């Protein structure tokens, strides 16, 4: 939902990224329709299981799949289109993060010198 650059100090850059607490709980709620289809309740037909029991034993872990995923996969494509090259690698500052809110975290590292001449 929002992408920032920031020049810390020399070649030290920050990039902050917000991402959408919607896009959040749609990827929540679709992760855990796939990992439905592959529980089975006793010996009963695979995927024949609860939302709610699904939700309930899956949700948290599933969240915690959902933003880490986001995070890495929005910074990926957040410095592709920044144009923006990393030194080794980045270091990730989540933010506070609050169920059903709009997510923000920063990614900071230090940019390099292209082949000059």
């Given at each position: 939902?929002?992408?920032?650059?920031?020049?810390?100090?020399?070649?030290?850059?920050?990039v902050?990224?917000?991402?959408?607490?919607?896009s959040?709980?749609?990827?929540?709620?679709?992760?855990?329709?796939?990992?439905?289809?592959?529980?089975?309740?006793?010996?009963?037909?695979?995927?024949?299981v609860?939302?709610?029991?699904?939700?309930?034993?899956?949700?948290?872990?599933?969240?915690?799949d959902?933003?880490?995923?986001?995070?890495?996969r929005?910074?990926i494509?957040?410095?592709?289109?920044?144009?923006?090259?990393?030194?080794?690698?980045?270091?990730?500052?989540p933010?506070e993060?609050?169920?059903?809110?709009?997510?923000?975290?920063?990614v900071?590292?230090?940019?390099?010198?292209?082949?000059?001449?």
């Amino acid at each position: 939902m929002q992408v920032s650059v920031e020049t810390t100090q020399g070649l030290g850059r920050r990039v902050t990224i917000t991402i959408a607490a919607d896009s959040i709980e749609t990827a929540v709620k679709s992760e855990l329709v796939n990992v439905a289809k592959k529980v089975r309740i006793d010996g009963l037909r695979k995927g024949k299981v609860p939302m709610n029991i699904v939700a309930q034993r899956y949700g948290a872990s599933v969240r915690q799949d959902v933003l880490g995923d986001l995070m890495s996969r929005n910074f990926i494509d957040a410095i592709i289109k920044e144009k923006i090259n990393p030194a080794g690698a980045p270091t990730y500052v989540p933010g506070e993060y609050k169920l059903g809110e709009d997510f923000t975290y920063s990614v900071e590292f230090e940019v390099y010198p292209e082949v000059e001449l």
